[PDB]
């Protein structure tokens, strides 16, 4: 029982952690796509 | 008339296991500090850029 | 303030783990104590049997042999009960839990 | 942004944040797979010992 | 329970209690089958003597 | 008596062992599917 | 994950852990089916002898 | 037992293999479309 | 580490980790550099026009 106390991570906490990690990752990827929409407004200025 | 059987097998095995655990702990500490170094390097690279 | 809160949260979590370890220590010691108590109860029953005057010398010798064996068991359990390399029942000290 | 095209500070910052998340994501997934709190001793080695 | 799956302290405690009862079950059945209170000196030896 | 002491595994013990082994197997398989949800946000990054 | 697609460390680690559990699963099922603690001497051979 | 050891591919292994193969295929097709966006700026250069 | 449950080897391992991280703090402070100036190694000030 004491070894179980020390070891044996809690699935409730681990599931919550991975779920929030996945959402943060997807948010980061979407924001990365928005930022990687690197300015074509420079091209827009160019032909003017 | 002492024989040839090992005197304190459990003590010897405990010493061996303790040595293994100590070396593993040292490796773990090194890995943690190396990961911290990686993170610091990435931050410094971003700021220098 | 966020840094202070992070420090407090981490400290409290580790403290909860330490308290769990203390509970484990108490459980182990109490189990050993329960076994010792059972042995003592059996010894008392044997003594009640022995003190009667109908028993002869050989009968008393056998009863005292059993008593000595169980006292040896009490001593052995007390000496050899161990938790994480600490003899809980072989010392008269104290333990501190953060 | 509008003034520079050779670099993207926003992209660099986002990539750093993504990697910082990835560390914890991998940790959590492997911890669930193994079913052990102390895994590979990348943590408090006192618990491992 | 909900925290851990590698061990089951409830199962361990239940098994211990079951074994403790099984000892007395065996003693009682043997005592009835033989018809003798003092049997094989697993008990007071002065009575047997 | 002695042979039974040596042999004759504890059915309670192995029932518990297989139950937790099956649970670990199912959890590992579900997590394995979650991991095999392999990098696909790279696909989203591509068209950006 | 977000960096690389050619490999999946999470998948590899999960597969390793699944195999490690599967070993004990097979051992337990075989032990229950036979009803014998010492089976095929893949364990303590002194008990077998 | 031995025949199963030799044969009987590991479903986890080939599921992962096909998943990453499909992702590589989709990424290659998208990048191929980006490349087949072949130089058309030469057309813009022409009328200049 | 301050808990009284930890044994001598446990305290030794924890102190090893602490020493590793203190070494990392010293290393980062000493080697952090901007334009050939160690920002974290001196106690001066920089004047910006």
The C-alpha atoms of residue H19 and residue H14 are separated, in whole angstroms, by 8
CA dist., res. E1 & res. A1, Å (int): 12
Count of helices and strands (H, E) across chain C: 2, 0
Beta carbons of G38 and F10 less than 8 angstroms apart: no
In 3D space, the residue among E14, G12, D44, D21 whose CA is nearest the CA of residue I17 turns out to be D44
Cβ atoms of G36 and F9 closer than 8 Å: yes
Which residues from G are below 8 Å from D16, CB to CB? none
Quote the CA–CA distance of D21 and A23 in Å, as a whole number.
Answer: 10
| CA distance to A24, C30, F35, per residue, from F32 (Å) | 20, 43, 5
Give I37's strand partners.
I34
Answer whether D43 touches B (CB < 8 Å).
Answer: yes
How far is C64 from C51, CA to CA, in rounded Å?
A: 11
How far apart are alpha carbons D30 and F31 in whole angstroms? 9
Answer for the pair B25, I17: CB distance below 8 angstroms, yes or no: yes
Number of Cβ within 10 Å of residue C2's Cβ equals: 6
As a whole number of angstroms, the distance between CA F31 and CA D32 comes to 7
- F27 and D32 within 8 Å at the Cβ level: the answer is yes
Give the three-state DSSP class for I34: strand
**Residue I37, phi then psi, degrees to nearest 5:** -115, 125
Q: What is the CA radius of gyration of chain A?
A: 22
- Who's near B26: CB < 8 A, 6+ residues apart? I16
- If 0-12 CB within 10 Å is exposed, 13-18 middle and 19+ buried, where does residue E31 land? middle
C-alpha span between G30 and G17 (Å, rounded): 20
Q: Taking CB atoms and an 8 Å cut-off, how many pairs form between chains F and H?
A: 20
Query: What one-character DSSP code corresponds to residue A37?
Result: S
Are F27 and E8 in contact (CB < 8 Å)?
A: no
Chain G hits for H24, CB-CB cut-off 8 Å, are: 5-6
Main-chain dihedrals φ then ψ at residue C83, nearest 5 degrees? -135, 115
* Biggest CA-to-CA distance, chain F: 76
Which residue does chain I place closest to D48, by CA atoms?
I10
Question: Cα B31 from chain centroid?
Answer: 10
> What DSSP state is assigned to residue I41?
T
D11 touches chain B (CB under 8 A): no
Residue to test with chain A: of F41, F42, F43, most A Cβ within 10 A: F41
User: C28-65: b or e for each residue (b if 16 or more CB lie within 10 Å)?
Assistant: beeebeeebeebeeebeebeeebeeeebeeebeebbee
Tell me the chain F residues in contact with residue H26 when contact means C-beta distances shorter than 8 Å.
43
Phi then psi for C33, rounded to 5 degrees? -65, -40
CB H20, CB F42: distance < 8 Å: no
Distance (Å) from the alpha carbon of B35 to chain D's nearest alpha carbon: 10
Query: Cβ B26–I16 below 8 Å, yes or no?
Result: yes
> Which of E14, I14, H26 has its CA nearest to residue D47?
I14
Question: Residues 6 or more apart from I4 whose CB is under 8 A from it?
Answer: C95, C96, C97, C98
Q: Please give the angle made by the CA atoms of B23, I16 and C82, to the nearest 5 degrees.
A: 75
- Technique behind this structure? cryo-EM
């Amino acid at each position: 029982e004491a070894q179980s106390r020390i070891q044996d991570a809690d699935y409730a906490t681990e599931v919550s952690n991975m779920s929030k990690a996945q959402i943060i990752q997807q948010a980061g990827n979407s924001v990365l796509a928005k930022a990687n929409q690197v300015p074509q407004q420079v091209l827009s200025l160019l032909q003017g | 008339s002492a024989g040839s059987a090992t005197t304190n097998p459990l003590a010897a095995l405990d010493d061996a296991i303790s040595s293994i655990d100590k070396f593993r702990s040292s490796l773990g500490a090194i890995q943690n500090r190396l990961d911290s170094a990686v993170t610091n390097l990435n931050n410094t690279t971003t700021n220098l850029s | 303030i966020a840094n202070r809160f992070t420090s407090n949260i981490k400290g409290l979590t580790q403290a909860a783990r330490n308290a769990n370890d203390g509970i484990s220590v108490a459980q182990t010691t109490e189990g050993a104590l329960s076994e010792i108590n059972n042995n003592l109860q059996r010894i008392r029953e044997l003594t009640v049997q022995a003190t009667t005057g109908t028993n002869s010398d050989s009968d008393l010798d056998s009863i005292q042999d059993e008593i000595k064996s169980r006292l040896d068991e009490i001593d052995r359990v007390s000496g050899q009960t161990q938790f994480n390399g600490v003899n809980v029942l072989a010392k008269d000290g104290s333990m501190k839990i953060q | 942004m509008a003034q520079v095209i050779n670099t993207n500070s926003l992209s660099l910052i986002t990539q750093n944040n993504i990697n910082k998340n990835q560390s914890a994501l991998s940790s959590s997934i492997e911890r669930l797979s193994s079913g052990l709190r102390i895994n590979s001793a990348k943590d408090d080695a006192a618990g491992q010992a």
